[PDB]
Design a protein around this ligand. Sequence first.
Ligand SMILES: N[C@@H](CCCC[NH3+])C(=O)N[C@@H](CCCC[NH3+])C(=O)O
Ligand code: IUM
Ligand code: IUM
Ligand code: IUM
Ligand code: IUM
Ligand code: IUM
Ligand code: IUM
Ligand code: IUM
Length: 517
Amino acid sequence: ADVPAGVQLADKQTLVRNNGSEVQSLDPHKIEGVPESNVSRDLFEGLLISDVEGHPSPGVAEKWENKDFKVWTFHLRENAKWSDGTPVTAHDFVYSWQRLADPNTASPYASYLQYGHIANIDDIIAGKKPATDLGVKALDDHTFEVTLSEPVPYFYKLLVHPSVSPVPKSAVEKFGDKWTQPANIVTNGAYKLKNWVVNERIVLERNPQYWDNAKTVINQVTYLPISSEVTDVNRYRSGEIDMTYNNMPIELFQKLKKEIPNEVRVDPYLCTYYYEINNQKAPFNDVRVRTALKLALDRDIIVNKVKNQGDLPAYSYTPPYTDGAKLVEPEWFKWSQQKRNEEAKKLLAEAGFTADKPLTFDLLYNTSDLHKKLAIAVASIWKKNLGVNVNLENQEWKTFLDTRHQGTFDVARAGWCADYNEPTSFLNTMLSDSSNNTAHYKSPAFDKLIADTLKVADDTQRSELYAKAEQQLDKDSAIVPVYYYVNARLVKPWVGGYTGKDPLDNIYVKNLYIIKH
Ligand SMILES: N[C@@H](CCCC[NH3+])C(=O)N[C@@H](CCCC[NH3+])C(=O)O
Ligand code: IUM
Ligand code: IUM
Ligand code: IUM
Ligand code: IUM
Ligand code: IUM
Ligand code: IUM
Ligand code: IUM
């Protein structure tokens, strides 16, 4: 943290943040969501980290170089240490990326190594080669070298993600799946795990061995698992919570902006809200059915009438303001909603549905007041505009992600937030074989368009191919785009250090401080 001259600090430097739900895990190779990544950034530190404005910056690596965008060499700082006092070395990174790649780990982010194109990843994921064949090596204790199968100019931008953070081999091997318990865990970020009570709280405390510990100010941070956005706001205003989660309640948001405007933070955010269709299950394997659902949803009503928080109506998966995005707005987005409705009813009529034998299916969402209200509105709109019936179902966060990976569903609420600011952070998740692909979408034409983006050494061709890939996804109606997010949350006046400028929202509690009050 960089405390401004003249600022008076509180005697007690403690922070309480709401985290939306109970995390899937604290193991960097077993996580996939926002709540999980929020705690991971405080505990495990990879090669690079985001600074307070979101720029890729030095983490364990203090400097790095590349040869032809294919061989990347990272120089690790000599004083990087784990919470037990042992040095962080290049051997820790070799072990960790191999564990991520190994199919026996079954990481939801195994494909992150495919996105960065590390040598031999496809064969390792398929079981044809051992994980020790991965294109990474330690040249010495402080030098980590990565080899790619093709030139990737933006490779270093990927390295702030939790999936490529180091894990402690000795704890993993001795305790197996219990390595993350407080008595066994070892961490290398600014904080250490103090307490963990499932469905109550996660408490972290300063790690005195962290290399940049002299600049850390907050001594303790608590993360809570509150899924009701109303309850989060209530406990913030009562004084218990210093920072809410970034999901705001429809019941109170308008009033909050009038009552405490300076505490209501609303900033740009690279995420898309959509309804994920299970593309491999009838009758959702029929493009006429997917297209009807996509067109019949009224984005103006949802965005401006129901939520009214500043989100923008969506027509694509990748947000149009992503660095490198130059997307073409589909002609169906320009029509009236009436014209969209007629096209949708005609398509369902062609697919065999009638008044006596309508289309009926499930709409799954993760427990939340906001997602429930949005799903109710969508159900009503689809009933009125298209004559379809839906059954809403809620599931806890960890269970919800598992259901989507299994294909245990019909249609599901969904969000995707960028891991790095480049269109492939989104597009790579729709590749036929991606570990992040919960749409269960497989298109040879889509896969080829993305493969061609790193076969050219040019950005205009690259951006044009990304636009064509979005057109292919839209043509097939793989998903139902709803809105591009704004990042809305409440932050007390005494919490310093949060700029609102990072469009990925990669906060580190080591950068915050409590002003005397
Ligand atoms: N990109 C993921 C994490 C973003 C925080 C780290 N930058 C993300 O959006 N995860 C999703 C769940 C993934 C579902 C699989 N398709 C989320 O948190 O909703
Ligand atoms: O000194 U007093 O919260
Ligand atoms: O690396 U260039 O355009
Ligand atoms: O590698 U360039 O802007
Ligand atoms: O900031 U740019 O590619
Ligand atoms: O409808 U049903 O699974
Ligand atoms: O609090 U209510 O729906
Ligand atoms: O909490 U008083 O000064």
